[PDB]
Design a protein around this ligand. Structure first.
Ligand SMILES: O=c1ccn([C@H]2C[C@H](O)[C@@H](COP(=O)(O)O)O2)c(=O)[nH]1
Ligand SMILES: O=c1ccn([C@H]2C[C@H](O)[C@@H](COP(=O)(O)O)O2)c(=O)[nH]1
Lengths: 316, 316
């Protein structure tokens, strides 16, 4: 099936992967260097062997495309995928006067019911961000996230470079260009970032009226990470094409350190016992073409019949 | 043999590649997305099926490692691989008072004996660079080349970031880091560069006391380009390891647009008729360890028994 390269990736680290310790203190069976490709004309690569929230993917992509870096847009669409980054900063600020959330990450997955007071404090933060502009502007804005890196690269002379926007015009004006690249790896920021980009960079390729895309992911969480990455960049590929009047080609995914967290073995093992189903169909708004002005309503996922979802203990 | 992934890469674009037009106006049979790996414990990947100048590779690597961006170092070692970039600029300057070298690139491979006056003018330039400091400093310095990008990344606040130097300390202090990256793709320079980096970025990986490296090459000339790239980055991998006290692992090579120029078909076809030989052995100076202070004398290539060299018409 369309999503077999995924399953195979997992099986290869399960069988061939080596134990290697990491940043976050769980263990991982990790390999280094791996490539897999999805021909996007056969269907959209949203895993069927496990239910994956397209809405979270869609809303996260649209946020990116807007050069938006404020968590408020996400919360508006019920996407809480990025909260903890803003929360981390909230806690470390003069204004925070509440139940000390030190290392809350570990201290929630752990036995103490820190998570009880955690979630209510988070609910407060989220509401503040959603309703108080001054607050939203203060802690709701992350700054150095993809949308910033894609649509507002800060140069030395102080200006802003719209990498993505430029790259698209280049594809229209020079389809056969071996320089269609968008990078997220700024060497002058990585050393002070909490999470340097996982999706380091991507490259477009046009040939035969087909638009392909290759994504280089320096680090990957096979079970929790990779499923999203695939649908996100396959969706990007579809959108950019919809604009450049091109047809959709393949989505090549290259990996640096592809790893499986030791606390995800049973989970991944269970998923591998499933038999893939016919992939879903993506349907974009024909009349609308400016992908930078798209909204949830313009992207329709069709025929998605996934197996139920596998719950998994997140690391940290 | 050790270098079989190379030959196979070529055969795949020969058989599976599609015709696609490019920047330089020759044609190319090109594919998009491809990965190959060389286990550096089996030998050094300097092609045997064709004679490849290790000296040019070695001297080019040492120049890089010095953060050197002046062609003078190269000319000193008889490496003329980068001349035409400095020449291009010489010609476009107020001071140049000589036989107009317009589009000399095309106009040399072509029928006119422009190349006659070209090579003597180049010989003059090269001598000026080699002997006159003011001149060397004016046109002999390229500025935005690898060594600059690796050892002197210019930030917004005006300073200089020693990416490579930092990355090495990181490997010593954090071997299991999924962030060991050195990038050459600055978004604020690419739009005005004559040749944006082909070797966009690379990533290190440590595990089991083995140091691996993955290189992402956005564009590749299978016949003329790739052979060098392999030996250059395999040598880099060996040097960095020699320093970090680590053992050498693999060299993974990932490609964006891997292409074969249409005027190289017979040449590549001939090379494929050859049977690989036992690869050579790299021998570094044990006593010397600071790779940034290495010189030609510290890198010994052993047992290199290559087939004669295949001459090939360079494109442009
Ligand atoms: O879309 C995403 C976001 C995060 N991660 C994972 C990758 C690593 O498991 C961890 C980041 O760790 P570092 O490699 O940066 O240390 O989060 C993913 O796999 N995919
Ligand atoms: O080490 C090198 C240097 C240059 N090139 C080639 C790649 C392309 O054939 C051309 C640069 O073309 P663009 O893709 O940038 O347009 O030179 C290589 O393959 N390897």
């Amino acid at each position: 099936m369309l999503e077999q390269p995924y399953l195979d990736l997992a099986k290869k680290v399960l069988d061939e992967g080596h134990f290697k310790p990491d940043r976050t203190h769980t263990g991982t069976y990790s390999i280094f260097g791996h490539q897999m490709r999805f021909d996007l004309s056969k269907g959209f690569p949203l895993l069927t062997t496990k239910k994956v929230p397209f809405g979270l993917i869609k809303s996260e992509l649209l946020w990116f495309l807007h050069g938006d870096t404020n968590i408020r847009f996400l919360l508006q669409h019920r996407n809480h995928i990025w909260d903890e980054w803003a929360f981390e900063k909230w806690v470390k600020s003069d204004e925070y006067h509440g139940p000390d959330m030190t290392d809350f990450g570990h201290r929630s997955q752990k036995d103490p019911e820190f998570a009880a007071v955690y979630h209510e404090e988070m609910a407060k933060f989220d509401d503040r961000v959603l309703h108080d502009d001054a607050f939203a502007a203060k802690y709701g804005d992350l700054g150095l996230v993809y949308g910033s890196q894609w649509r507002a690269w800060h140069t030395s002379k102080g200006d802003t470079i719209d990498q993505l926007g430029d790259v698209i015009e280049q594809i229209k004006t020079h389809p056969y260009s071996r320089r269609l690249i968008v990078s997220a790896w700024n060497p002058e920021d990585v050393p002070t970032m909490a999470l340097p980009p996982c999706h380091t960079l991507y490259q477009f390729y046009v040939n035969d009226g087909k638009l392909s895309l290759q994504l280089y992911q320096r680090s990957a969480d096979i079970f929790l990470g990779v499923p999203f990455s695939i649908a996100s960049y396959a969706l990007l590929t579809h959108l950019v094409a919809h604009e450049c009047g091109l047809e959709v080609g393949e989505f090549i995914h290259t990996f640096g350190d592809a790893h499986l967290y030791v606390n995800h073995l049973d989970q991944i093992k269970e998923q591998l016992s499933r038999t893939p189903r016919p992939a879903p169909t993506l349907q974009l708004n024909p009349d609308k073409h400016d992908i930078f002005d798209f909204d949830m309503k313009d992207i329709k996922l069709l025929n998605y019949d996934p197996y139920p979802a596998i719950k998994a203990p997140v690391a940290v």
